[PDB]
């Protein structure tokens, strides 16, 4: 049918999305999955949320990414309003007004990461790696576990993704370009790309690799 998760809420807010669900015969879970069809976000006045994991895996799945107000209104008018007219435009980080999920919902015939071999390297925070990996898989990259697992050939296009903050290391991440032959960039590359569903490119994200 439908299936939901929420993000950014509070018990009372949540209780309220429940009310919605109960009434409308909608399924409501803790945890986003293949099958989750909606993602209800805390937003301000006019549909800017903050950037959370569910936020991204939201867009990645081309799921319905709608601001809490869908709910409270659909309650207030005692029926189900158009997800169509409630989508989240943007976010505090990536612009109040960037049509993210829009692009994404409709661009399912051409994922931003067509023909990419991505590899999330070294440790991340607030975001389990496997979830990051799940994310790019969702935009039709394909995941690599270790740098030396990169499909060689001119065939495809590899990229190493790191996030420098979670490191304690000096011989660390300036040095990936030695252990192979790929662009290296920050996780921000992926998130900003995914936010906008606009495949950013990498000038601004490159990490300086020791030759």
């Amino acid at each position: 049918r439908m299936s939901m998760v929420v993000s950014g809420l509070t018990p009372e807010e949540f209780m309220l999305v429940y009310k919605f669900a109960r009434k409308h015969h909608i399924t409501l879970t803790n945890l986003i999955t293949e099958e989750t069809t909606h993602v209800v976000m805390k937003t301000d006045a006019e549909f800017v949320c903050e950037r959370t994991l569910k936020y991204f895996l939201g867009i990645a799945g081309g799921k319905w990414v709608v601001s809490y107000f869908w709910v409270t209104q659909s309650i207030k008018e005692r029926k189900m309003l158009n997800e169509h007219d409630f989508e989240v435009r943007g976010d505090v980080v990536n612009g109040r007004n960037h049509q993210g999920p829009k692009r994404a919902r409709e661009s399912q015939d051409r994922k931003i990461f067509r023909g990419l071999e991505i590899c999330c390297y070294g440790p991340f925070t607030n975001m389990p790696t496997d979830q990051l990996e799940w994310m790019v898989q969702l935009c039709g990259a394909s995941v690599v576990k270790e740098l030396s697992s990169f499909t060689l050939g001119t065939g495809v296009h590899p990229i190493v993704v790191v996030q420098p903050d979670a490191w304690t290391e000096d011989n660390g991440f300036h040095a990936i370009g030695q252990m192979c032959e790929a662009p290296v960039v920050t996780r921000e590359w992926v998130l900003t790309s995914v936010a906008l569903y606009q495949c950013q490119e990498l000038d601004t994200y490159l990490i300086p690799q020791i030759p």
Binding site: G8, E50, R51
Partner: peptide, 4 residues
């Protein structure tokens, strides 16, 4: 939830 964390944010980004």
């Amino acid at each position: 939830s964390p944010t980004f």
